[PDB]
Amino acid sequence: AEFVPPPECPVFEPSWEEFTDPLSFIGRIRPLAEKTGICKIRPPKDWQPPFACEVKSFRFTPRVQRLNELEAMTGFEQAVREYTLQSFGEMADNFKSDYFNMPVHMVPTELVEKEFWRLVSSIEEDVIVEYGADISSKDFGSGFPVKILPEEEEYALSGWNLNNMPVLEKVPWLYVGMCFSSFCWHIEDHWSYSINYLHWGEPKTWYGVPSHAAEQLEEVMRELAPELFESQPDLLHQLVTIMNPNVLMEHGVPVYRTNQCAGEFVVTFPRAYHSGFNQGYNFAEAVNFCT
Ligand SMILES: O=C(O)c1ccnc2cc([C@H](OCCN3CCCCC3)c3ccccc3Cl)[nH]c12
Numbered sequence: 001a002e003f004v005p006p007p008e009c010p011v012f013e014p015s016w017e018e019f020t021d022p023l024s025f026i027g028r029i030r031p032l033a034e035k036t037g038i039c040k041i042r043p044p045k046d047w048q049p050p051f052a053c054e055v056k057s058f059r060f061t062p063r064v065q066r067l068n069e070l071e072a073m074t075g076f077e078q079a080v081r082e083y084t085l086q087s088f089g090e091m092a093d094n095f096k097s098d099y100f101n102m103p104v105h106m107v108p109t110e111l112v113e114k115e116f117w118r119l120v121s122s123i124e125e126d127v128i129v130e131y132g133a134d135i136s137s138k139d140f141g142s143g144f145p146v147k148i149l150p151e152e153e154e155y156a157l158s159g160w161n162l163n164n165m166p167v168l169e170k171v172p173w174l175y176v177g178m179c180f181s182s183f184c185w186h187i188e189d190h191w192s193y194s195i196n197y198l199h200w201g202e203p204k205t206w207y208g209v210p211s212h213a214a215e216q217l218e219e220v221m222r223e224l225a226p227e228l229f230e231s232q233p234d235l236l237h238q239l240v241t242i243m244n245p246n247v248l249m250e251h252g253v254p255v256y257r258t259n260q261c262a263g264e265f266v267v268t269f270p271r272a273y274h275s276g277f278n279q280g281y282n283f284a285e286a287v288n289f290c291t
Pocket residue numbers: 131133134135173175182183184186196204238284286
């Protein structure tokens with residue numbers, strides 16, 4: 001009954017010539033990545049943007065996440081508190097190392113993935129984590145340099161800088177993750193693309209569904225969702241659309257997975273449902289774009 005990992009989504013390692021334009025590159029890999037919903041892009045080895053957030057002033061109040069909140073269906077549990085980037089990392093590393101009884105970097109990604117989905121549906125164990133998930137790049141700056149040192153100028157002007165993506169048909173948002181912090185199944189507003197960059201930290205685990213199976217996923221969601229949420233509009237239902245990928249796979253929905261490591265991009269395609277969780281303390285940046 002252990003979690004069965006979905007097949008891996010495509011991973012592209014473009015050369016420096018192919019890495020010249022994101023929209024041109026995504027358009028060329030489209031015939032394959034469109035059929036998997038998500039794909040991972042590894043930039044060339046020497047493409048390393050320096051972290052450009054104001055780490056000194058970085059303070060945030062993460063949301064509280066109870067992993068088994070849906071299964072517990074059949075409000076003063078924990079208030080939201082303020083962290084700094086360093087104090088949140090100390091809390092995140094202490095939680096994971098105490099939970100697995102080993103150094104955080106020695107915990108296999110398959111074990112965290114297996115334990116996360118066990119905790120989501122567990123009724124005896126109540127695990128509660130925190131996620132810095134409502135942080136705009138206007139708050140303390142983007143993780144990318146934005147027009148800086150001369151060595152940073154190439155990255156401030158790069159097309160893969162998420163601040164330089166075409167967003168007209170917003171600004172990038174930031175995610176400070178810890179172990180077991182997660183985001184449930186959803187598509188973007190206007191069925192837009194989304195591009196996600198992990199600046200540093202432990203990997204972010206993804207699950208994606210191709211757009212041609214979008215209506216099949218919504219059917220399975222509606223059938224198995226709690227009856228009180230079944231009639232809710234999609235924008236509100238998407239706030240609690242947590243579902244084990246094996247359940248979707250058992251109902252014929254194709255699901256692909258990947259572990260997004262530091263310095264790697266993840267692109268979601270139009271109407272491609274996606275979800276995931278963080279393996280540990282990390283820092284991500286994401287923005288929607290249209291083609
Ligand atoms: O956490 C990731 O890395 C990640 C990757 C891809 N898509 C999403 C979508 C979210 C999403 O954030 C809500 C808020 N933000 C978006 C809307 C504007 C404000 C900022 C979320 C957070 C936690 C639980 C559920 C969800 Cl849906 N997080 C994503």
